[PDB]
């Protein structure tokens, strides 16, 4: 009775081209796609418009030195971006760019002409250029008490998740699907409601975030306690949803060695195009209408489920290392700089970002 | 977007959503935009 999903998996593997690279070239198609709207060149007038519109934080690079306007709406997110730029700036040509550190992208596709803004997440309906989010170093959500200074240090979190995965080999993992997060999108509601109706099937509960105003923000129940990502690994089936934009949760779940259930296919981060449905994770319809069938399928095809989980874990382990993040920043900014059709001059009043 | 939904405030500070802006009200002992600095 599972032939349909089984054939989809076979088909998806037949389509799959594994990335054999030892560097971040796996993702070069993402850079190429994101820069396609600017292939006619980025003029000085275009840059002045982006800056005037305050769509992001204005950075400049000249003579391998980084300069920035005074204002950054989220200093910790600017600091996280700066961490990676400063790592690679000795090899970057002169350029300037506007780096949006808000959650949401800034350049809808219907805007003509396209203007260049760097954002961490988009859909295909935006012309923003994706960059590796600040949180790979610092500045992700400060979820009290588990991440009191903000979710960050991907290098360390990788180590902790791999160790947790080793403590929870697949056959020892719990078969109840699992989610702990806040109500950043109502697309999450059907899972929380299914969990309340069928708690043996799904354990999905709303935590609160710093915008909480009332019980509406948790669908009328007391907020759940926050749970460290390393404590997700005891569950075989881990759900991932959009929030405001894409979520930082996603990459972590793979390293548990658990099978990721990824809901929807619109909101991206730069690495998402290399993660393939049925190869690396289970795709779930945006409206969750097939979630019960998918959960029955994986339980009845546990060998297939494990193979998918192992492939997804291996992809993040091998192709989303800290070095891949630094590499992507370097290749992204180097390629982008080619499309600036004029010579950048440091702006009056921009301090240098050291060291 | 209410910028507080992504918890920009560290160290159990309170986030206030202003017109397309945010403010972190620190617990005593902390300061800075994100309440990241120990006073
Ligand atoms: O109990 C929790 C709740 C959240 N998070 C993490 O905190 C971040 C913010 O999660 P939330 O669901 O609040 O918002 P999102 O960013 O997913 O929209 C994500 O990386 C979550 O994985 C967590 O580790 N444990
Ligand atoms: C990156 O890897 C590709 C092969 O995957 C190779 O062609 C390229 O030369 C490598 N680049 C560097 C700078 O190592
Ligand atoms: C599996 O986890 C679910 C949800 O947290 C829990 O209700 C259930 O008791 C667990 N089962 C076992 C066998 O540990
Ligand atoms: Ca706000
Ligand atoms: Cl935001």
């Amino acid at each position: 009775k599972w032939k349909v999903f089984i054939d989809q998996i076979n088909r998806s593997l037949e389509n799959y081209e594994p990335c054999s690279s030892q560097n971040c070239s796996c993702y070069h198609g993402v850079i190429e796609e994101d820069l396609t709207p600017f292939r006619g060149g980025i003029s000085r007038k275009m840059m002045a418009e982006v800056v005037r519109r305050k769509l992001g934080t204005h950075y400049q690079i000249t003579k391998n030195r980084l300069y920035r306007e005074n204002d950054c709406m989220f200093p910790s997110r600017c600091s996280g971006v700066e961490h990676f730029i400063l790592e690679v700036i000795g090899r970057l040509p002169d350029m300037e760019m506007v780096i949006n550190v808000r959650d949401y992208p800034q350049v809808p596709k219907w805007m003509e002409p396209a203007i260049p803004v760097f954002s961490f997440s988009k859909t295909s309906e935006y012309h923003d250029i994706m960059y590796p989010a600040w949180t790979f170093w610092e500045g992700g959500p400060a979820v009290w008490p588990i991440y009191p200074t903000g979710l960050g240090r991907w290098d360390l979190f990788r180590e902790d998740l791999v160790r947790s995965a080793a403590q929870w080999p697949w056959k020892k993992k719990n078969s109840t699907a699992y989610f702990r997060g806040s109500r950043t999108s109502p697309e999450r509601d059907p899972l929380i409601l299914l969990s309340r109706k069928n708690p043996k099937l799904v354990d999905a509960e709303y935590t609160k975030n710093q915008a909480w105003k009332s019980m509406k923000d948790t669908l009328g129940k007391p907020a759940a306690k926050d749970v460290h990502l390393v404590d997700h690994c005891k569950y075989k089936y881990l759900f991932n949803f959009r929030g405001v934009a894409a979520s930082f949760r996603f990459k972590h779940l793979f390293l548990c060695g658990s099978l990721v259930f990824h809901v929807g296919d619109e909101w991206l981060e730069f690495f998402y195009p290399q993660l393939k449905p049925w190869v690396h994770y289970i795709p779930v319809k945006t409206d969750l209408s097939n979630v019960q069938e998918l959960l029955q399928f994986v339980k009845a095809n546990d060998d297939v489920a494990q193979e998918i989980a192992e492939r997804g874990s291996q992809f993040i382990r091998n192709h989303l290392q800290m070095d891949d993040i630094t590499c992507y920043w370097e290749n992204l900014l180097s390629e982008y700089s080619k499309f600036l059709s004029y010579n950048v001059t440091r702006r009056k009043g921009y301090d240098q970002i050291i060291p | 977007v209410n910028e507080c939904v992504s918890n920009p405030c560290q160290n159990d500070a309170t986030c206030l959503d202003q017109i397309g802006e945010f403010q972190c009200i620190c617990m005593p002992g902390y300061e800075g935009v994100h309440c990241e600095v120990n006073t």
Side-chain angles (χ1 to χ4, degrees), chain A residues 60-67 86 88-96 343-346 352-353 355:
Chain A
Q60 300 181 307
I61 296 170
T62 64
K63 307 175 185 306
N64 305 282
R65 294 188 158 206
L66 183 63
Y67 302 92
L86 288 171
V88 305
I89 197 169
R91 306 183 293 273
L92 291 178
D94 290 6
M95 70 186 78
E96 65 185 323
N343 292 330
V344 175
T345 50
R346 174 188 173 183
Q352 194 186 342
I353 305 292

Side-chain angles (χ1 to χ4, degrees), chain A residues 73 75-76 103 141-142 148 209-210, chain B residues 4-7 9 11 22 34:
Chain A
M73 177 159 284
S76 61
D103 286 0
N209 61 49
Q210 282 171 16
Chain B
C4 297
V5 298
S6 290
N7 287 35
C9 303
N11 296 309
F22 73 97
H34 300 274

